[PDB]
Amino acid sequence: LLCMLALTFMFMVLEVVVSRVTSSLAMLSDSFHMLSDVLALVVALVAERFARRTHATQKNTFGWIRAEVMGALVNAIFLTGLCFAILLEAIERFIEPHEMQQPLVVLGVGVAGLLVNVLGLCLLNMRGVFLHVLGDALGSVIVVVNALVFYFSWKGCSEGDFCVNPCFPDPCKAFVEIIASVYEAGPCWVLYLDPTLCVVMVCILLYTTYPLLKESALILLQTVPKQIDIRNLIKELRNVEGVEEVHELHVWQLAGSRIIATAHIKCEDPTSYMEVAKTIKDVFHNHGIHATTIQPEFASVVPCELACRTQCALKQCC
Amino acid sequence: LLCMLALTFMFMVLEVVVSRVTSSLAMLSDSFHMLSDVLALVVALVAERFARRTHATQKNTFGWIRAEVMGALVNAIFLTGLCFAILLEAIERFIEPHEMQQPLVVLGVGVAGLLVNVLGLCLLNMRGVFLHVLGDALGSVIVVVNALVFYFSWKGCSEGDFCVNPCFPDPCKAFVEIIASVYEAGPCWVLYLDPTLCVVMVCILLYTTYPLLKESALILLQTVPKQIDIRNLIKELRNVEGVEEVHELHVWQLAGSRIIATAHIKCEDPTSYMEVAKTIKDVFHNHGIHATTIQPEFASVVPCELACRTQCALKQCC
Ligand SMILES: CC(C)CCC[C@@H](C)[C@H]1CC[C@H]2[C@@H]3CC=C4C[C@@H](OC(=O)CCC(=O)O)CC[C@]4(C)[C@H]3CC[C@]12C
Ligand SMILES: CC(C)CCC[C@@H](C)[C@H]1CC[C@H]2[C@@H]3CC=C4C[C@@H](OC(=O)CCC(=O)O)CC[C@]4(C)[C@H]3CC[C@]12C
Ligand SMILES: CC(C)CCC[C@@H](C)[C@H]1CC[C@H]2[C@@H]3CC=C4C[C@@H](OC(=O)CCC(=O)O)CC[C@]4(C)[C@H]3CC[C@]12C
Ligand SMILES: [Zn+2]
Ligand SMILES: [Zn+2]
Ligand SMILES: [Zn+2]
Ligand SMILES: [Zn+2]
Ligand SMILES: [Zn+2]
Ligand SMILES: [Zn+2]
Ligand SMILES: [Zn+2]
Ligand SMILES: [Zn+2]
């Protein structure tokens, strides 16, 4: 983990610095994606370290096990925020285009990123990581092809001869239009490739990270998992022996694949309660739910036999 | 709520657009703060709309009560991401200083924001809103004083007269040293003022948003609330004549003041369980807990009388 984490972090630092100095948007977006990747590795390591020894902690009774889910959510939404900022910068660049400072350094960092992804390729359990590395390499080669197209087409100028087309506003009024030799700059295919390509990059990043963010948000919010069917479960619970009807059923996913159930039941006879709670355990275990807790209300218009009279209707769940 | 929402959103759009036009970072940070405020209002409205008709939906058995807290976390982390982008821009501006484009429009939008905050004042439950609007007004004061100081002190050349600037690199090297020696006034107190005020603004935003993010994170992660002491509660539960030992006790907060408790008690005398259950209800209602699902495991090699046959990968918590 750390063996690639350190390399990715150091490359991220240099990449961010040189990109924002050179002020090229697609490069900045690719560096932000590498930033999201390295923070994903960081949160994965933190979650593994915390989950290695989870117990009945004084502060957290359940344990810091939702750490991986919350880290995924934080990374996804942090990337979304940075991507929104980058899109705002791209719109600003549409407002007033700027040329690339130096294609040579951009090509160098692009091939460096390509080599970084190639090295990471060597290091679906591993196929998912390989696909993520391939997507990062795709972003890197998009940066590289941007650099190539800019270098091959943008003839530009480096002398005092009239070179800048009216599309690009002249710097410092071009010395009041020199108060020289006639020259025409590059065609209308550059000075716009960088932002019109960074928008594609940011759109693809948003499309890739939306399902992960949605899944993490649904996990963090108390939502029944798609695997468990609430209607089938409630109907099958009603169709048991010794139980009249069930209420206050709460089912939610904690993290990964450990589901917690909660319900209240009523039994006709207090005697011989066992072999009935065993039936409830078996029927819950039949579905994906494994950790349960069933409170019996022993045997009428009142919904639940156990309710504090002086209770904030709200405070009491549902 | 929407009456101020529409005005705030329209002003946010205008200020963001004009700030990106003029490239002023302090105004950009203030606009980001306004964006955070309007998004907070939006999430509050949607949370109230969802909470007005909270029901045991098939997808969400608990209900979308946690929507407000999730929106608060989303806003806090989005603001943090935008603030990180702002720090990147500020470090860039330290690397290469750029002067403000048009002080007049910046002063106009600053006084417009001040008037917006004044109208907000015109329109703890309300003391918190007063504190927030006073903070936003303070940010507007920062941006307007930045504009005022830049306008009065800066004396950059506008015409073709000589202006030797060592502070900022001249565009096109001033026609390559031109291939009325007017000197600028106080470059130190002018060029660097905007990025440093932006850094101060973003630092104060981080300081004022960190506690909210921490509380929201502790709410989403299943953490015992600071109001309830878990050790005292378990000691009182153990100090009950009916129950022998209490195991698998989980306490967590849903949203606001809604605490749900879970326990696996073991007791004898099946015909008198309800006598114990009333005592458990009373002792839980003594603390902040108001919703419990105490499951009696009726009668020490095995800790819990009910358990999965395989308990694969100990999905069941603890
Ligand atoms: C790319 C940008 C967003 C910077 C990311 C930096 C991370 C490496 C930082 C940000 C938040 C940090 C965490 C914030 C809080 C804590 C709790 C801390 O536990 C304590 O000792 C708590 C002490 C207390 O507050 O009482 C251990 C480090 C940790 C996990 C930090 C680990 C390092 C983190 C993830
Ligand atoms: C071009 C500029 C102005 C940026 C535009 C941003 C949004 C208009 C885009 C970015 C990502 C898009 C989302 C990417 C993915 C999806 C999932 C897609 O299908 C699903 O909901 C689930 C698909 C699946 O998982 O198979 C519906 C459209 C949606 C929400 C897209 C809606 C439009 C979004 C938010
Ligand atoms: C501007 C850039 C370059 C640096 C930004 C640094 C911030 C992320 C740091 C600087 C000072 C820090 C604060 C210094 C002191 C505290 C008090 C302390 O918070 C509490 O009060 C929690 C404990 C309590 O319950 O009293 C720890 C977090 C906090 C807000 C820190 C949060 C992180 C801050 C804002
Ligand atoms: Zn990646
Ligand atoms: Zn099971
Ligand atoms: Zn009940
Ligand atoms: Zn109560
Ligand atoms: Zn309930
Ligand atoms: Zn505000
Ligand atoms: Zn038990
Ligand atoms: Zn447990």
Question: In a few lines, what is going on in this structure?
Answer:
2 copies of one chain form a homodimer. Chain A is mostly helical and 318 residues long. Chain A has 9 helices and 3 strands, in the order ααααααααββαβ.
Beta strand % of chain A? 5-15%
Distance between the termini of chain A: 44 Å
CA-based shape of chain A: elongated
Strand and helix order of chain A: HHHHHHHHEEHE
Number of helices of chain A: 9
Q: What is the number of E strands of chain A?
A: 3
How many strands, what sense, and barrel or not for the largest sheet of chain A? 3 strands, mixed
Largest interface, with Cβ-Cβ < 8 Å?
A-B, 86 and 89 residues
**Number of spatially distinct domains of chain A:** 2
Class from secondary-structure proportions of chain A:
mainly alpha
CATH class of the largest domain in chain A: Mainly Alpha
CATH architecture classification of the largest domain in chain A: Up-down Bundle
Report strand order across the widest sheet of chain A: 1-2-3
Distinct ligands: cholesterol hemisuccinate, zinc ion
